[PDB]
Design a protein around this ligand. Structure first.
Ligand SMILES: CC(=O)SCCNC(=O)CCNC(=O)[C@H](O)C(C)(C)COP(=O)(O)OP(=O)(O)OC[C@H]1O[C@@H](n2cnc3c(N)ncnc32)[C@H](O)[C@@H]1OP(=O)(O)O
Ligand SMILES: CC(=O)SCCNC(=O)CCNC(=O)[C@H](O)C(C)(C)COP(=O)(O)OP(=O)(O)OC[C@H]1O[C@@H](n2cnc3c(N)ncnc32)[C@H](O)[C@@H]1OP(=O)(O)O
Ligand SMILES: O=P(O)(O)O[C@H]1[C@H](OP(=O)(O)O)[C@H](OP(=O)(O)O)[C@H](OP(=O)(O)O)[C@@H](OP(=O)(O)O)[C@H]1OP(=O)(O)O
Lengths: 155, 160, 665
C-alpha cells in the first residue's frame, strides 16, 4: 500500500478524447459517439487508470436490469501493452468490486471475453469469475467471433 | 531554475505567463497592486536566459473580524517546465514570507474541482485541507474547492 | 492651500520634472510637517535627482520622530529602515550602511532583505570569513537561488576545479531535493569529471520522470566536446534499457519501470533536433508515441521538430492533435493558436482562442481587453506575411496603445505608496515607467510597423477606433515610422537593429548627417554585421557619384569620417575587403553578393556563384539563411536569375528534405 504510483481518475469532458484513444488502441472493436456520451453520465463506474501520472488504461461500466435482477456489465477493462503485468488491471477491477459491496443491491457481475484472449481469462479467473455461457457470432469482423460469458455471483 | 523574489520589472512577464496558461486573467494594474502592497510574497522562477517560466502571486487578506491569513491569487508553471519541483518550491518560499512579515496563521485559495494537477499539489504535498465547496464560483459554471493550510507547524521550525 | 499643491505634484511626478517636483513637496513639508506623507514625499524627490547624501538626512530626521509615535506599525517601520539602508548603499557609503544595518536588524521583519544586503556589504569590505556564513544561511532558506552560490565562490575563493566543486558537493548531501546544486557543476566541469557528474544527473531525472531534462541542459549544448559525451551516454542508456531494464548492464540495482525507456527516447528526440538531424528525431519520437498515445508532451515535441525542419503547416497539425486530449490546459491551446498564426490560418486561430475566453464578446476583442500582447504580435506578423499591410498596422498600433495604458496605470500609486510606507517597491516602479518600452514585446511590434512603412514608401498601393484601410492609405508613411523609432532610439541602444532601422528611414529622406550618425553607432557594436555592410556600401556610393546635389559645408565634412572608417579605396574594394575577411560565413557571403551586383549590374554571374555556395565548410548553413538566399534570387536583388533560382532550390532540397520553401513545383 505504501508507495503507490498507480492511481485512478475520473473521466471528464476535458479528457474524453484520451478515453477514446485508449479504447481504439487496446480493443479491436469500435464504439460510436453515443457510447461515449453515456459514459459521462454514469459516475464512479467509469475511471481512467494512471501510472506515473500518464493515462495507461480505463474501465467503463453501466447499470443493467435484466432477468429480474440488478446486474453490472463491465464493458471495457484493459491497459496498454507496454504497461501490463504491473497491477493496473487489479486496481481497476477492485474499484468496480468496492462499489458493489458498498451498495449491496447488486446481484451479478458479468462480461464477455474473447475465446482467443486466454491471458484475460486467467486474470479474471483469480477474482472469482466462472465461464457460464459460450456465445457464437458475437463479434462481427474479428477472426475470433465467439465469446465466453464470465460471471461473478455476489449473493 | 533560479527561484528568486519578484521585482516590479518582472511583473509584466508574469502577466504573459498568466495569459499563456490560466483561464482566469487579470489586468496590469492588478499586478502593480500585488507588488506595492505585499512585495515580499510574490516569487518567480526563471532559466539562464532570464525569461520567466513560473510565478506565484500571493497576498494577505485585510479582514478585521479574523486572524491575519494569506491568500494565493495565482500560480502557474509553463508546460515546458512542469514536473520539475518548481511549484512546491514556489509556495514554500511564499508561505515562509507570510509568517515572518505579517504573522499569518493560515493561507487559503480556490481550486477547481477537476484540476487534478493542482489537487495533488495542495493536498498530497503542501497539505491543504478542503474547507468549503463553493458552487458555480467560476465563469463556466464549475464548482471550486476552498482550501486551507495551517501555518503554525511551519512557524515553529523557524523559531527553532 | 492643500489639494491644489497635492495634485500638482501628482502630475509632476507623472511627467518627471524633478526640479519642479522637489519645489512642490518642499512647500507641503512647511505646511503640513506632522503627516508622514510630507516627509517621505520630500525624500523621494532627492532620491530621483541622484542626490543621495541629502536624501539620507531627511530619512534620518523622519525616522527618529516615528519610533516614538504611539500609532507605530511593525511592518511600516521595517520598510522605512530597509529603504534608508538602500540610500546609504547607493551613495557608496558601504561602511556606515553595515553599521546602520547591524543596529536595527532586530526591528526588521524582512529577514531576506537584511541577510542579502549584509552578505553583499561583507564582500565589498573584504570580510570574507563572516560573509561565507551569511551566504550559507541564505542558501538554507532558498537552495534554488543562483546568487547565493556566486557569493560563496566570491567568499571562499577556490583555486582549482577540485575545491570549487566542494561548494556544490556539500549542497547535495545537505539538500537532497535541490536541482540547482546538481546542475551548476555541469557548466564548468570537463572531461571524465564532467561525465560521472552528468551521469548521476540523468539517472536521477529519468527514474523520477521529469520532462524538462532537456530544457535544463540546453544551455551547455554550444560545445562540440560536451555534446559527444551526452550523445554517447543517453544512447548507452537507451540500448540497455530495452534489453535488461537497467541504465548500465553492469550495475546492481532493481529493474526499471517502462516509463524510464520512454523518457530516454524523449531526450534523444530533442537531442537530434538540436543537432540538426530531423530524420532521427522523428524516428525516436514516433517510437515513443506508439507506446503511450495519450501523452501530451510527445505531441508538443513532434510539432517542434517539424517547425525546425521547415514545415509549419505540418507542425500546426500536431498542436491541434495535442489540445484534443486535454481541453482545460491553456498552454497547449495558446501554443496551438500560435502555430496556426505562423501557418497563416487567422480564422482557424480565432476559433481556437474562443475556447478559453469570455462568452459575451468576440475572441480577438477579449484578448485586446486582456492586454494579450503575444497574440497581437503573431497576428501582426502573419498579416504582414499575407500582404495584408493594413490589418497588420492595426495590431501594431494596438500593442503601442497597450503601452500608453500602463504608463498611465501608475497614477493611482503615488498617493497609495505614501499612505502605506512601501518605499522600496514604489521607487522601483518609478524607474520602471521610464524604461518600460525596452520590453521585448515593444521591439518585435515596432519592427513590423517600420518594415511595413518602408514598403509603403517604396511601392505605394471613449477613444478613437483604428480602421485598417485608413492606416495603410497614409500620405506620410515615414513620419508614422519615426514615431515607432523614437522610443527605440532612446531606450534600446544595445541592439544593432535599432541604429540600422534608423538608417533606412533617413536613407529614404536624404539626410546624410543622420545616416552617418546611425552607421557610426552600429559600427561600434558589431563591425562584421552583414546588414551593416549593406548600409555603408549604400552610404559610400551616394557620396562618390552623388557629389553635386549637396551643400558645400555638408560635403566637405562628410568625406573625412568615411576615410576614417575604411581605407583609401573606392566602394568596390571595400566589398572585396569585406568578402575576404569572413568568406566562410554564409550570411556575410550573401550580403557581399548583393552589393557586388548593386555597384555594377554587369557582374551578375559572379554575384550568383557567391551566394549559392553550399559546401560543408561554411558557417551558418542552416535553414534560415538558405531560405534568405533563395528569396533574394526571386526578389530581384541579384537580377533576373530565374534559371539560377531553380538549380539552387533543388540543391537546398537535398540538405533540408522537409522544408516547404524548397519543395518542387
Ligand atoms: C474477449 C475480450 O476481448 S474481453 C477484453 C479484456 N480486456 C483486454 O483484453 C485488454 C487488456 N487485456 C489483458 O489481458 C490485460 O493484461 C489485463 C486486463 C489483465 C490488465 O491487467 P494487468 O495490468 O495485467 O494486472 P496484473 O497482471 O499486474 O495482476 C493480475 C495478476 O494476475 C496474474 N496474471 C495476470 N495475467 C496473467 C497471465 N497471462 N498469465 C498468468 N497469470 C497472469 C498475475 O499473477 C498477476 O499478478 P502479478 O501482478 O503479481 O504478476
Ligand atoms: C491559481 C490557484 O491558486 S490553483 C490553479 C493552478 N493551476 C493553473 O492555473 C493551471 C496551470 N497548472 C500548472 O502550472 C501546474 O500544473 C501546477 C501549478 C498545478 C503545478 O505543476 P508543477 O510545476 O509540476 O508542480 P510540482 O512538480 O512542484 O508538484 C509537486 C507535486 O505536485 C503533484 N503534481 C504536480 N503536477 C502534477 C500533475 N500533472 N499530475 C498529477 N500530479 C501532479 C504531484 O503529487 C507532485 O508530487 P511529486 O513531485 O512527488 O511527483
Ligand atoms: O512562449 P514564449 O514564452 O514567448 O517563448 C517562446 C517559446 O519558448 P517556450 O516553449 O519555452 O515557451 C518558443 O518555443 P515554441 O514556440 O517553438 O514552442 C521558443 O522557440 P524555440 O524553443 O524553438 O527556440 C522561443 O522562440 P524564439 O526562438 O524566437 O526565441 C520563444 O519565443 P519568444 O521568446 O521570442 O516569444
Amino acid at each position: 500500500m505504501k508507495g503507490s504510483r498507480i492511481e485512478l481518475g475520473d473521466v471528464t469532458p476535458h479528457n474524453i478524447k484520451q478515453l477514446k484513444r485508449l479504447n481504439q488502441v487496446i480493443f479491436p472493436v469500435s464504439y460510436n459517439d453515443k457510447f461515449y456520451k453515456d459514459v459521462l453520465e454514469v459516475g464512479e463506474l467509469a475511471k481512467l487508470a494512471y501510472f506515473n501520472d500518464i493515462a495507461v488504461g480505463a474501465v467503463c461500466c453501466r447499470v443493467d436490469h435484466s432477468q429480474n435482477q440488478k446486474r453490472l456489465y463491465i464493458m471495457t477493462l484493459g491497459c496498454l501493452a507496454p504497461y501490463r503485468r504491473l497491477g493496473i488491471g487489479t486496481k481497476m477491477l477492485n474499484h468496480v468490486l468496492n462499489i458493489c459491496e458498498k451498495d449491496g443491491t447488486f446481484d451479478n457481475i458479468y462480461l464477455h471475453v474473447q475465446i482467443s484472449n486466454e491471458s484475460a481469462i486467467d486474470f479474471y479467473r483469480k477474482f472469482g469469475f466462472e465461464i457460464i455461457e459460450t456465445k457464437k457470432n458475437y463479434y462481427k469482423r474479428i477472426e475470433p467471433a465467439d465469446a465466453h460469458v464470465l460471471q461473478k455471483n455476489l449473493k | 531554475m533560479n527561484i528568486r523574489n519578484a521585482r516590479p520589472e518582472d511583473l509584466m512577464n508574469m502577466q504573459h505567463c498568466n495569459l499563456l496558461c490560466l483561464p482566469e486573467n487579470y489586468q496590469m494594474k492588478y499586478y502593480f497592486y500585488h507588488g506595492l502592497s505585499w512585495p515580499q510574497l510574490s516569487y518567480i522562477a526563471e532559466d539562464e536566459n532570464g525569461k520567466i517560466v513560473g510565478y506565484v502571486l500571493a497576498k494577505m487578506e485585510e479582514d478585521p473580524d479574523d486572524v491575519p491569513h494569506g491568500h494565493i491569487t495565482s500560480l502557474a508553471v509553463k508546460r515546458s517546465h512542469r514536473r520539475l519541483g518548481l511549484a512546491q518550491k514556489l509556495m514554500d518560499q511564499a508561505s515562509r514570507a507570510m509568517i515572518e512579515n505579517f504573522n499569518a496563521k493560515y493561507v487559503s485559495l480556490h481550486v477547481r474541482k477537476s484540476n487534478r494537477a493542482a489537487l495533488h499539489l495542495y493536498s498530497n504535498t503542501l497539505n491543504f485541507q478542503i474547507s468549503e465547496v463553493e458552487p458555480k464560483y467560476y465563469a463556466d459554471g464549475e464548482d471550486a474547492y476552498a482550501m486551507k493550510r495551517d501555518l503554525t507547524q511551519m512557524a515553529d521550525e523557524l523559531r527553532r | 492651500n492643500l489639494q491644489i499643491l497635492r495634485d500638482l505634484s501628482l502630475l509632476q511626478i507623472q511627467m518627471r520634472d524633478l526640479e519642479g517636483y522637489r519645489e512642490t513637496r518642499y512647500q507641503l513639508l512647511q505646511l503640513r510637517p506632522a503627516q508622514r506623507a510630507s516627509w517621505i514625499g520630500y525624500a523621494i524627490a532627492y532620491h530621483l535627482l541622484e542626490d543621495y547624501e541629502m536624501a539620507a538626512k531627511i530619512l534620518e530626521e523622519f525616522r527618529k520622530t516615528q519610533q516614538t509615535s504611539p500609532d507605530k506599525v511593525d511592518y511600516e517601520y521595517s520598510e522605512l529602515l530597509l529603504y534608508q539602508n538602500q540610500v546609504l548603499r547607493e551613495a557608496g557609503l558601504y561602511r556606515e550602511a553595515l553599521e546602520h544595518l547591524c543596529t536595527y536588524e532586530k526591528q526588521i521583519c524582512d529577514k531576506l532583505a537584511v541577510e542579502e544586503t549584509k552578505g553583499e556589504l561583507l564582500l565589498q569590505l573584504c570580510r570574507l570569513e563572516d560573509a561565507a556564513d551569511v551566504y550559507r544561511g541564505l542558501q538554507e532558506r532558498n537552495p534554488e537561488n543562483w546568487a547565493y552560490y556566486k557569493g560563496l565562490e566570491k567568499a571562499l575563493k577556490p583555486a582549482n576545479m577540485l575545491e570549487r566543486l566542494k561548494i556544490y558537493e556539500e549542497a547535495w548531501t545537505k539538500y537532497p531535493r535541490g536541482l540547482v546544486p546538481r546542475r551548476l557543476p555541469l557548466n564548468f566541469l570537463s572531461g571524465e569529471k564532467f561525465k560521472e557528474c552528468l551521469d548521476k544527473f540523468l539517472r536521477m531525472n529519468f527514474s523520477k520522470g521529469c520532462p524538462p531534462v532537456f530544457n535544463t541542459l540546453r544551455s551547455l549544448y554550444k560545445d562540440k566536446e560536451k555534446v559527444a559525451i551526452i550523445e554517447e551516454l543517453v544512447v548507452g542508456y537507451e540500448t540497455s534499457l530495452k534489453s535488461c531494464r537497467l541504465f548500465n548492464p553492469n550495475d546492481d540495482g532493481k529493474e526499471e519501470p517502462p516509463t524510464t525507456l520512454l523518457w530516454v527516447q524523449y531526450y534523444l528526440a530533442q537531442h537530434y533536433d538540436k543537432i540538426g538531424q530531423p530524420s532521427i528525431a522523428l524516428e525516436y519520437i514516433n517510437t515513443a508515441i506508439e507506446s503511450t498515445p495519450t501523452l501530451i508532451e510527445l505531441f508538443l515535441v513532434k510539432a517542434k521538430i517539424y517547425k525546425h525542419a521547415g514545415n509549419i503547416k505540418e507542425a500546426a497539425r500536431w498542436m491541434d492533435e495535442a489540445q484534443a486530449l486535454d481541453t482545460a490546459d491553456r498552454f497547449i491551446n495558446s501554443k496551438c493558436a500560435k502555430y496556426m498564426l505562423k501557418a497563416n490560418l487567422i480564422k482557424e486561430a480565432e476559433e481556437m482562442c474562443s475556447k478559453f475566453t469570455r462568452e459575451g464578446t468576440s475572441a480577438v476583442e477579449n484578448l485586446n481587453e486582456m492586454q494579450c500582447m503575444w497574440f497581437q504580435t503573431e497576428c501582426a506578423q502573419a498579416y504582414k506575411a499575407m500582404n495584408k499591410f493594413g490589418e497588420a498596422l492595426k495590431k501594431c498600433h494596438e500593442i503601442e496603445r497597450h503601452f500608453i495604458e500602463i504608463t498611465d496605470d501608475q497614477f493611482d500609486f503615488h498617493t497609495y505608496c505614501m499612505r502605506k510606507i512601501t518605499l522600496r517597491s514604489y521607487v522601483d516602479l518609478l524607474k520602471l515607467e521610464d524604461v518600460l518600452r525596452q520590453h521585448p514585446f515593444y521591439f518585435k511590434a515596432a519592427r513590423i510597423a517600420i518594415e511595413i512603412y518602408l514598403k509603403l514608401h517604396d511601392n505605394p498601393l471613449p477613444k478613437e477606433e483604428l480602421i485598417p484601410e485608413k492606416l495603410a492609405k497614409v500620405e506620410t508613411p515615414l513620419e508614422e515610422a519615426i514615431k515607432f523609432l523614437t522610443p527605440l532610439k532612446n531606450l534600446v541602444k544595445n541592439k544593432i537593429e535599432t541604429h540600422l532601422f534608423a538608417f533606412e528611414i533617413y536613407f529614404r529622406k536624404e539626410k546624410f548627417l543622420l545616416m552617418l550618425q546611425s552607421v557610426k553607432r552600429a559600427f561600434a557594436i558589431d563591425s562584421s554585421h552583414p546588414w551593416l555592410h549593406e548600409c555603408m556600401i549604400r552610404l559610400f556610393n551616394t557620396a562618390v557619384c552623388e557629389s553635386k546635389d549637396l551643400s558645400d559645408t555638408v560635403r566637405t565634412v562628410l568625406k573625412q569620417e568615411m576615410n576614417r572608417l575604411f581605407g583609401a579605396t573606392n566602394p568596390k574594394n571595400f566589398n572585396e575587403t569585406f568578402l575576404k575577411r569572413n568568406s566562410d560565413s554564409l550570411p556575410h557571403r550573401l550580403s557581399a553578393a548583393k552589393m557586388v551586383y548593386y555597384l555594377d549590374p554587369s557582374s551578375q554571374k559572379r554575384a550568383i556563384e557567391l551566394a549559392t555556395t553550399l559546401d560543408e565548410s561554411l558557417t551558418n548553413r542552416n535553414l534560415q539563411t538558405c531560405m534568405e538566399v533563395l528569396e533574394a534570387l526571386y526578389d530581384g536583388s541579384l537580377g533576373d536569375c530565374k534559371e539560377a533560382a531553380e538549380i539552387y532550390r533543388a540543391n537546398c532540397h537535398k540538405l533540408f528534405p522537409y522544408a516547404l520553401a524548397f519543395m518542387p513545383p
